[PDB]
A paper describes a structure:
The CBD ligand is sandwiched between the two nanobodies, which pack against each other in a face-to-face and largely antiparallel manner. Overall, the complex buries a total of ~1400 Å2 surface area among all three components with about two-thirds contributed by protein–protein interactions. As an inducer of protein–protein interaction, CBD is completely sequestered at the center of the nanobody dimer and snuggly fits into the central pocket constructed by the two immunoglobin β-barrels. Although a small channel can be found connecting the central pocket to the solvent, it is too narrow for CBD to enter or escape without the dissociation of the two nanobodies. As expected for its ability to bind CBD independent of DB21, CA14 is characterized by a surface groove formed among the three complementarity determining regions (CDRs) and the framework of the nanobody. In an extended conformation, CBD is embedded in this overall hydrophobic groove with its five-carbon alkyl side chain secured by CDR2 at one end and its p-menthane moiety vertically seated next to CDR3 at the other. Its central resorcinol ring is stabilized by a hydrogen bond formed between one of its two hydroxyl groups and the side chain of Asp34 in CDR1. In contrast to CA14, the CBD-contacting surface of DB21 is noticeably flat with only a minor depression created by CDR3 that accommodates the methyl group sticking out from the p-menthane moiety of the ligand. At one end of the CBD-binding pocket, CDR3 of DB21 and its nearby framework residues directly pack against their equivalent parts in CA14, thereby completely burying the p-menthane moiety of the ligand.
Numbering used by the authors:
A (entry chain A): 1 to 120
B (entry chain C): 2 to 120
C-alpha cells in the first residue's frame, strides 16, 4: 500500500562536530533501495545531500557542498541506510529528511525531518 | 496541474548522439527537479539523470551514463535537455521525462520517447 520511513538522529554540535542519521524503509517497497537525504536550510532551496541505490551502492551521489565530509552507506542486515556527517559546518544547519525514491509509483517518500544545528 | 512535453529521440548508429528535451508547463513552482528515466524491454524504469532548480546542486547521473550524457536546464523555459553522446546498443530504451516540485512527493511522468541505437 504505502512505504514508511523511520528516521533517527539529529542534534546540536559545534563546527567540526559529527552526527549520524539513519533511515529504515518498510512497507510495500517492492525491494527497491533507492535512498538518500535532502536538507532544507532556512531561506534556501532544498538541497539533495546524498543518494544511493541497490544493495551494492551504485549511482552514489553527493552534493558538492558535502563531498569529503558526508558518507552515505547501507547495512543490508537492516535495510537501514546511514548518513555519517563529519566535520560539520555552520551552513550545514538545516532540517534533514530521509528520502525513498519509488520508481514503480514515481513517488518520493520523506522521513520525519530532523534538525541539525551547527553553531559556535 | 503540471504537463510535460518531450521532444527528440529516434534511431542512431552506435557512437552517435541524440538530444532529448522536456518542457514543464503549468503549476510548476520555481523549485523542482527534472530528469530522465529509461525503460528497456522487460525492465523497470531506470534512473538516467536529474537536475535541480537549485544551482548550488550539481546534476546527478546514473553510473551507466556518466561521462556520456549531459543534462542542462533552460530556467527561462522550464525546459531541460539531455545530450546523449557515444550512444551504445545498450542505451536502447523508451526514455521518459520526469518532473517533481521540491515540495511534492508525487512525480509527474512524461510521455515515452523511443531511443534505438543499432549496428
Ligand atoms: C524528477 C526526478 C528526477 C525523480 C522522479 C521520480 C522520483 C521518485 C524522484 C525524482 C528525483 C528527485 O527529485 C531528486 C533526486 C536527487 C537529486 C537530483 C538533482 C541533484 C533523484 C530523483 O530520482
Amino acid at each position: 500500500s504505502e512505504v514508511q520511513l523511520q528516521a533517527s538522529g539529529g542534534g546540536f554540535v559545534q563546527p567540526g562536530g559529527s552526527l549520524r542519521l539513519s533511515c529504515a524503509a518498510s512497507g510495500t517497497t517492492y525491494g527497491q533501495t533507492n535512498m538518500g537525504w535532502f536538507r532544507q536550510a532556512p531561506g534556501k532551496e532544498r538541497e539533495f545531500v546524498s543518494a544511493i541505490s541497490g544493495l551494492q551502492g551504485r549511482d552514489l551521489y553527493y552534493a558538492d557542498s558535502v563531498k569529503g565530509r558526508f558518507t552515505i552507506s547501507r547495512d543490508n542486515s537492516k535495510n537501514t541506510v546511514y548518513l555519517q556527517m563529519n566535520s560539520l559546518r555552520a551552513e550545514d544547519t538545516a532540517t534533514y529528511y530521509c528520502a525513498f525514491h519509488d520508481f514503480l509509483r514515481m513517488w518520493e517518500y520523506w522521513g520525519q525531518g530532523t534538525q541539525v544545528t551547527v553553531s559556535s
